[PDB]
Structures are given as C-alpha cells and as structure tokens.
Amino acid sequence: TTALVCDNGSGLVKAGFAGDDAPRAVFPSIVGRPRHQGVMVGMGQKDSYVGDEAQSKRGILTLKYPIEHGIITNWDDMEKIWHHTFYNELRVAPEEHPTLLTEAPLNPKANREKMTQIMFETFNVPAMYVAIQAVLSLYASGRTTGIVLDSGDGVTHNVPIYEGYALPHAIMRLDLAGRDLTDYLMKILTERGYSFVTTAEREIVRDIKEKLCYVALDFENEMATAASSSSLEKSYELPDGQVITIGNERFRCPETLFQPSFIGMESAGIHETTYNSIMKCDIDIRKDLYANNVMSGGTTMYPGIADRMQKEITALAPSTMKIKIIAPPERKYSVWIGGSILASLSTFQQMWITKQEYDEAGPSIVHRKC
Amino acid sequence: TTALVCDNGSGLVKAGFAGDDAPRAVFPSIVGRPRHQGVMVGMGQKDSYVGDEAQSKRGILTLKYPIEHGIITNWDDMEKIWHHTFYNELRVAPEEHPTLLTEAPLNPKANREKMTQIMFETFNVPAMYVAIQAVLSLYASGRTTGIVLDSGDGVTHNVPIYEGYALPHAIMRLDLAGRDLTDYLMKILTERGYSFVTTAEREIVRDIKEKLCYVALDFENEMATAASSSSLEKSYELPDGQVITIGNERFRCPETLFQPSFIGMESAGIHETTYNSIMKCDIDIRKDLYANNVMSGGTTMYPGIADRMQKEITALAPSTMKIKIIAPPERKYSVWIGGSILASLSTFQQMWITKQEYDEAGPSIVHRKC
Amino acid sequence: TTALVCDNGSGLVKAGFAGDDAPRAVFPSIVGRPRHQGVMVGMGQKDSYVGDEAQSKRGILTLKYPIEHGIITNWDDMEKIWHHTFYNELRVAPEEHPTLLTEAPLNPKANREKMTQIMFETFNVPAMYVAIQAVLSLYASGRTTGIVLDSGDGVTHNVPIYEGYALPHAIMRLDLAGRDLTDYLMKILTERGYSFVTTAEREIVRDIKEKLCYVALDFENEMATAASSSSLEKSYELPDGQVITIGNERFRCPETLFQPSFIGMESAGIHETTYNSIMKCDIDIRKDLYANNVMSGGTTMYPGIADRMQKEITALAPSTMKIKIIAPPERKYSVWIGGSILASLSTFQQMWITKQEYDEAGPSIVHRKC
Amino acid sequence: DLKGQLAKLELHLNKTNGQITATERTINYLNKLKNPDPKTKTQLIELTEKLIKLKQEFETTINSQHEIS
Ligand SMILES: Nc1ncnc2c1ncn2[C@@H]1O[C@H](COP(=O)(O)OP(=O)(O)O)[C@@H](O)[C@H]1O
Ligand SMILES: Nc1ncnc2c1ncn2[C@@H]1O[C@H](COP(=O)(O)OP(=O)(O)O)[C@@H](O)[C@H]1O
Ligand SMILES: Nc1ncnc2c1ncn2[C@@H]1O[C@H](COP(=O)(O)OP(=O)(O)O)[C@@H](O)[C@H]1O
Ligand SMILES: [Mg+2]
Ligand SMILES: [Mg+2]
Ligand SMILES: [Mg+2]
C-alpha cells in the first residue's frame, strides 16, 4: 500500500503519495461563499465553493481562510477542505491508506487532539501520524546537523538539530510571514493611487508580490539609486487591461523581514533570531550550525535573499567561522519532500498510531511523543 | 606470547604490549550519556558513548568519570572502559595473554579484590598481576636508590626506596592533582568575565590549562612584574571563534601545588612533603635520597617546575649536601614504561597469579604480597 | 548624619536611610525609550523615561534592563538610574552623606572599580563601601553561624559562615532566578493559546507569576491530581478585560528551581547545591550549618518552598541530624535590612573608604578587602 | 611501486627503531645490578646480542632505502 502525505499549510494544500518527487495535487486552502442573489433558474445551488474553483470565480465570492498563523480557526471549513482533497482531488478512498500530517512547533495542544479526532471518527483512516514541519526539511536536505529556517505563509520558525538530537530550548517562533507582506504591499501601493480593498483585490496583490519583488543587498544605497534614476520600474497588467507601474515598492515589501519595525512590530529581523538561536545552544556545537544553514518554505524564494542572509550573519557572527546558506532550488516543496521520505523508511513503519491504540489510550496518545 | 600492560589511570587510559617504547593506545577514561530527545529515525540508538568518541561529541552528552582520587566509584562504567580497551581499541582477545595493572599506594583493600574478580570471572585472563605506580617509575629511570614523586591526575604520592628495599613507613599520599587545578582555573577565570560551568566547558578549561601555564621561580616578584607591565598576557581561541586573554592566571593555577591554602586545604606544599618523607627515613640513607630525586606523572610537565623544586628543597635542606632533580623528558609515560620492562624480565615471569591459584586460595591471594 | 543604604539589584532598586525598618523608596530598575513618532505639539520631548513612570507608560516604550545576571551591561542607563534614585526619588543631595552598596559574590573585578569611579568622580560622595549580598542577610536574621541561600532575580548564591569566619571555598553561584521562570512561564503558557511576546507582555506575565504560583510538596502526585480533576484552576484578568485560566502551569514554573533540566540547563537543583556547599566544609561544623539554614531574596516567597526544601534536604542528609529552614516573613527586604544595621554599628564607622584614600591609593583600594 | 616499497621500508625502519629503544632501556636497567639473579645473567647476554642484531638490521634497511633514493 501507499501512504498519503498531506501537508495542510497556512496558504496552500499539497497532497500526494509516498515515494514520489512532487505532490500529486496542490491548491489554495480557501473557502468562498456566494455574496449575491442568484436570478437564473436551473443552475445548481452551491452553498460554498472550495479549492481552486473558488479562486476561479473570485468575482462574486467572499473568500475566507480556515487557517491563520498556523492555528486552525474554523473547523467546518477545514473539514470541507480535507474532504475535497481526499475525494475530488486525489480521488482515493481514505479508509485503505494511513496518513501523515505536519504541524508547526509550539502550537496549542488542543489543535493536535482535534485534528486526530477529525481524522479518526469522521474519515476512519487506519493510522495517522503528525510531524514537526522543520524536522522533515532535514531529510530532504540530506544532512543531520543544521539549523533549519522554515518560513511558510503565516509563521516562521527556527529549529536547530545536531547529530539527530533536536534542542528544544533553542527553538524560536515568529508571526511574520507572507500574509503580512501582502498587506504591507497593499498599504504602500496605496501611495501611487492604486487602491486595493476587497479580498479578490488582495489575491491580485499577492500575484503582484510573487512576480515583481526582490531583496536588495543593501537598502539605503538601493533607495538612493531608485530615487536618482528611473531604472527600477516595472509594468504589470491587471485582469481589467490596466497597467500598474511599480517602483521602490519592489524591494520595500520583502525588506520588512529584516526590519520588522515597518509593520509596528518590535521583534528583531530574521537574521537576529537565527543568530540568537545559534548562540542559545552549547559552545561546542556552534561551529557546525554556523557551517550548515538551511532554508525552506515559499516565502524564501525572493531573488537575492540568500546573499543578504549570508552577509548579515557574517557581519553579526565572529570571524574565523565559515558561514554557508544551503538554499537548494525547489525549496518550496522541501517540507513535503521530507514527509514522503519519512514515510518510505522501513523503521518508521513501526511508529504509526493505530486506530485501536487511540481508541484505548485516548486523546493523550499523540502528545506522548510531542 | 606478549603480555598486555594496561595502566588504568585517574584521567587517562594507556594500554599497550610488552617490549615497546610507548602505549599502543591512549584515550581519556570518560563515559558520556545522551541528554536530549532524539528526533531522527534510523540513526540507531546508543545508550552511552565511551572513550574518544564521547570526547568528540561532548556537545550533547553528560560526561562522567568512573574513577576519582584513584579510587573507583562506579563499576559498571569501569567495566565498559576495560571492554572498550581490550576489544575496540587494542583489537586483541584477552583470553590468550596475561595482564599487568597499576594501583596507587594506600588505596582501599576492596578495590584490589574487586578488580581481580572482574579480571578473572568476566574477562577470563589466564594470569593477572598488580603493581604500585611509584615503584614502576624506578625501572624507567634506570636506578635503584631514590625517592619517586609520582603526581598523576587525582592524587600524588611519594615512595622512597633504597637498594631495592622500599621503606613503607615513609610513604606519603596527598589528594592534590590536576582536577583541582582545573577547578581553580575555572574559579579564577571567573574574575575577568569568562564563565565556564558545564562539563564540556571544564574540558575546554583543561585544554587552556595544558597549553598556557607555567610555574614562576618566585611568586611575589612575578605578581609585581605582571601587575606593573602587560607582558605576561596570552591569547587563546575557543571552539566558538572567541578570544580569551589570560594574564596572571597563567601562574596562579600551578602555584596551588606549593601553597595548598589557595583551595582551602591545610596540608603543606609538595616540597615540604618530599622533605618530610626524606627526613622520616634513617640517618645514613638521607644523603643518597637527596642526591637522586625523581619526577613522574603528567602534572609535573609545567615549564619550570624542576627549577622551583630544586630551589625550595635546597633552601629547606642543610648545606654541604647536593640536590639534583632527575626530571627526564617523556616523563608522562614513565610509569607505563616501567611496567613493560617489568613484564620483560625473565625472573618476573614466575610471579604472576595464575587463575587456578585464585580459584583455590581465594580473594586474599592478591593481598599476600601487598 | 545619616548614611544612605542603596541596594542596586537585578530586578528592583531599594534605596533608604540607615536606622530604618524599610527602604524609603522602591522601584523597578528599567529604562524605557519611546518607539513611535509623536505628533502633538507643546509637549515635553523626553529622550527616555526611567523608573516607575516607564512602567506606567509601557504601552509605547521599549523597556530595557541595564543589569542582568548581577553583572552590569549598560553603564549610561545605570548612571541614569542612580541619578533618579538620588535626586528625584530620595530627594537628598549625595555630597553630604556616605553610601553603602551591595554586590553579589564571584562577580568580575572591573565591575567594582567602575562602580567606585562612577560614585566618586561623578557624584562626589565623601565615602563609599560595598558588601557581599549574602553576608548582610545574617545581620537581619540575627545569628552568626549559618548557610545563607540568597536567591534574588538574576542569580542565586550560597555562602556558609561559621562563628563569623566566612569559608570562601564553599561559596556557590548559579544563574537560575526569576527571569528564567518568567520566560518559562511565557513558553508554557503558549500551549493553551495565550501568546505573549513583547516586553510589556513579559511584564504582564511577571505579574501573573507573582500572583498565581505555588510549589507542590511532591510533583508527580500533583500532576496526577491536576489531570484527573479540575480543582487546580485559577482565573486572572488582563488589562484588556480578558480572562486567562491557568491550570498545571501554576506549579510548573517554580518547579524549575528543583529540576533545572526543564530549561536545558545541566546543573543540579538548589537543594543539591545547598547539600554540596554544606558537605564541602569541614567535618566538625556540618551539624551547625545543618541546624541553621537561611533564605532571602524575593524569589523565595513561593507558598510552600520552605516545606519542600526541608523535605528534600532531610531526604538527602543523614539521619540523627536535625534540619530547620529559618524562613522569616518579610524576607524580601532581608538583604537591605542587613545593610542598615551594618551602617548603624559604631565599629563599622571606621571601615569606609574615604575619598582621599581612593585618590591616593588608586582603584585597587576596594579590592584589598575583597 | 617504487613509492609503496619505499613506504614499506620506512615502516620497517620505524619498527626496528622502536625495538632498539626498548632493548636499550632494558639493558640500561640491568647494567646497574651488582648481584643479579642467575636468570638475569643469561638474559643480559641475550639482550646484548639482540641489540647488535637489530643495529645491523637497521643499518641494512637504511642502506637499502637510500639506494632506492
Ligand atoms: N516564487 C515566490 N516568490 C516570492 N514569494 C512566494 C513565491 N512563491 C510563494 N511565495 C509566497 O509564499 C506563500 C506560500 O507559502 P507556502 O509555500 O504555501 O507555505 P506553507 O507550505 O507553509 O503554506 C504565498 O502566500 C506567497 O506570498
Ligand atoms: N603538557 C601538560 N602541561 C600541563 N598539564 C598537563 C600536561 N599534560 C597533562 N597534564 C595534566 O595531567 C593530567 C593527566 O595526568 P596523567 O598523565 O593521565 O596521570 P594518570 O596517568 O595518573 O592519570 C591532565 O588532567 C592534565 O591536566
Ligand atoms: N510574592 C512573590 N511571589 C513570587 N515571586 C516573587 C514575589 N515577589 C517577587 N518575586 C520575584 O522576585 C523577583 C524580584 O527579586 P528581588 O527581591 O528584586 O531580588 P533583588 O533584590 O536581587 O533584585 C521578581 O522578578 C519576581 O519574579
Ligand atoms: Mg510550508
Ligand atoms: Mg599516572
Ligand atoms: Mg536581592
């Protein structure tokens, strides 16, 4: 049999089978509800569209996100997403195969229990397991000693591991991610005249973000160059056949990652969190973590993030130490690529939580290995 | 056949074959146990690392010393060390060859019996012998009349011999050794700001001690010179790419040997113990012992210890009488170099304790020659 | 004249006059800097608020602590705190009166010198003295033989004294204190959903700690009772009119004191350090130290700490020996109450360090009695 | 091949020197004796002969190693 490896994310859902190199299906995790009357007769009355069809018909829908900052807020919508993924998208009955899910570190306990109950009582899978998102990245990378820097939508976290002994006191968590960058892009695009308010307009701004953005190696010099000349300008086309012309905002959106004071937050940029995590471990292992940094998640695909990260860490860290930022391509799916590998391993095939085990022990079972 | 000559020490293990000039293998006598969870799958779990691999991975282990002050405290870990030495390190089955061990004088009786039992019932060596550490030094030195001053880690002892007639009432024993110096180094390095607490940090401090230390010919004048100028400063580099700068502490660590009141102890310095041992023998032999002094053990490798020892003894002892401190190089292995020689001697090949002798006579056998 | 007795602490400042029973003024040792723009006109442009007004307006400030782990990190802020204490809070010119300060044991030398210089060159007090925090506790307690266990914010130390002969080799120091408990409270409160990140939010968590916490007599049984039933639950109200409901975390925060492995630290709990300190003294005085233990500092106000301390020490120590934990009320100010008494004593009025003495001898003066 | 055989000659020379050192130490100890045990009287002669044999073997090995060079 093949064991599904679903990765319920904060901004996308990637579902596939074990022993593959890419998710079988990938689609946004949104639920759209109709807003208007409906005048024609004979058309099917849909209470709510889910998945990609909602993204197709965003004009007359009120799109909502069941997940936010990793935590799950709405449960009916999440169950609808899971049903759509299992039946309509993957087209495989869930009873036959086990399943593997991923949850970010330091999340509330209740989340795990509710997930388990919804995956046992309602869907009736024969076995389920849940894993920390950061850890699975190291299987995909191919090493055992490192400091992953998973940065998904919603939240970003750092988890240092050494010789396969995760240090739990050095783990760091932070609520700066792609959604805040999208909101800031809207707020700063307001200056030139372009006003985006509704949710679908936010979806458009998200596409604008994805296509036209980059991270400057140095910020003040880039601002001076953009102000003096007019070479840092790009033209994009809306669905309405209108042309936006973006200038400085190309590198003021991602810059909030390194300067969280733009949004009014107070925490330090991501480089400082990485450095603090490294310096919260023991003295003897700091060199190895320095040597092997790792990035994951979609948000770390901005052109030029690796160079700035290396420069900042090198400036912060002492000399005589060599810093490398392992930033392989296709990092977007890295987390998922871990899970499939973890499923394949023969040893891991003994660590599931069978249904009868949950029936007997109770909800606490999952937390024993937490 | 070749007879193993192992020297279970207090801070290092040296094991080799007879008729050689150096131990075949040398490695610290520590046992490290993992401290953290362990998150990766497949690595294969290990309960406890032993020997040099534990020193390699000190970051995530709780290093423990099975031996302390010569006495053996933990046995299940002392047996693990012996097994590692015989099989993994030396790579020779213990059944074929006999074995020779070394034990410091004035140690508890039970130690000897338990060592014998563990070396007969469990490992099944055909013959075992045990010798006093100080005596074996005199074979390496090449003389017969002298007063050895073996100072290993853990403890330091003096054993005067004359014409191969060891005087047992003049033997002296004292519990000042390298471990106390390491602790004092930590305590006094605290002043400049550098704080070392964990066991691995103690291991780092031990290296700091080994590399950068020396014994001043005179103490008050050296302190005055170090305070007035800034020439007695050295720079050392941690594993974390940080730079320590040591000043006076270079010669305040070993000075506790001659002034044990630094640690709160009350006994007299080592020169006074040597003088007392010499003046506790008969009148007619004091000149010969004064003439031929011997140093051994690692702790006596500080640059300048021989000169200060000679000066102090000359000041203490009467004039008209000549004092020399025989302090040959490679004194570190001196004790072991004795044992191999003792194994080689044809006469000594009649003095072992065969297995059947221990089976018949009982545990008391070993103590008959004590 | 009256001699001021300030006690610059790690988390609070207590300043008062000699011959009193309580500090004249007590206020937190923080410095807040504004974070936002400032739009209104006619107001007073303040670079930085200090003391209690900063605590009042924590909403829009970035609070910083000049002291940490006893050591002083930032000097400008510390000078600002001292100026605020002398002029605005106490309302007495510092030239007329001498002053007495307190510094924890085993701290770096440079600290003392810099403190002296800042208290002579800038403020111009006619005489200054500095004392060890633990020693002053014994004057307030009223005995001469004991083993103090001062545990302030920042650090905790043990100093055994016998017949007014402080043993310096038995002193112990450890970096576990209230700040680590506050951080652990944040980390474990994360589980139920309540996420506190900013500094003012940490200040709120500190109040939560102070009000609702206690130490269980035994830990496993308490966890079982809290899990089975729902009687160990308390409700607290934030400044935002929201209600937190705390359960187990009531007694998992202070438990870190007795099990430092929660934070990843490796040292032993406080009972083991007390036992080791007692067992590092001479044989003949251990009974007297066993009989008279003393606690000080704010951190030792958790309801039920005395009983657990007594139980653990009794279990560790041999029978036939009687253990009592002298834990008087109002222990919070105990250290300060010592200093005032020490100021009053007629003999002590000869031990100050006059200004001309420092001018002539130089900075080393203070260290002569160290 | 030349490099490998040169390395083997170097290893053999190192082993020979290691044997010489121990034999010299044992003879140095035995010389000081004044009324040795009858067994030690023969062992001293045996070691004295073995030292000479080892020294000529060392000379031959070094000569061969130089010749290859
Ligand atoms: N090529 C890209 N360049 C810049 N940002 C991207 C890119 N691809 C995705 N993103 C950002 O990452 C987010 C998706 O992150 P995702 O990989 O789904 O994280 P998770 O898997 O944890 O949900 C999107 O909201 C988008 O803003
Ligand atoms: N070169 C050196 N300089 C100073 N101290 C040394 C040196 N080498 C070893 N030591 C000290 O000696 C100790 C090791 O002693 P060792 O020779 O093992 O005695 P034993 O064999 O009785 O254990 C170490 O703890 C170390 O502190
Ligand atoms: N009543 C209390 N209950 C529990 N903890 C307290 C209480 N009062 C103070 N604390 C803790 O003690 C700390 C203050 O310690 P303090 O007495 O100021 O030490 P110091 O005098 O060395 O600064 C605070 O951070 C707080 O967390
Ligand atoms: Mg992701
Ligand atoms: Mg030794
Ligand atoms: Mg205090």
Coordinates of C-alpha atoms and ligand atoms in Angstrom, one line a residue, chain C residues 7-12 14 102 133 150-153 155 157 296-299 331-336, ligand 6:
Chain C
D7 CA 20.8 48.0 47.1
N8 CA 21.1 48.1 43.4
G9 CA 19.5 44.7 42.5
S10 CA 19.0 42.8 39.3
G11 CA 15.2 43.5 39.1
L12 CA 14.4 46.2 41.6
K14 CA 15.6 49.7 47.0
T102 CA 25.8 45.5 47.7
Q133 CA 24.8 40.4 49.5
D150 CA 20.0 34.4 48.9
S151 CA 18.0 34.0 45.7
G152 CA 17.3 37.3 44.0
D153 CA 16.3 38.0 40.5
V155 CA 21.3 34.8 40.1
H157 CA 24.2 32.1 45.6
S296 CA 16.5 35.6 51.5
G297 CA 15.5 37.3 48.3
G298 CA 12.2 37.8 46.6
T299 CA 12.3 34.6 44.6
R331 CA 12.5 38.1 53.8
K332 CA 12.2 40.1 50.6
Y333 CA 13.9 43.1 52.2
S334 CA 16.2 41.0 54.3
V335 CA 19.4 41.9 52.5
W336 CA 18.6 45.6 52.8
Ligands
MG6 MG 18.2 40.6 46.2

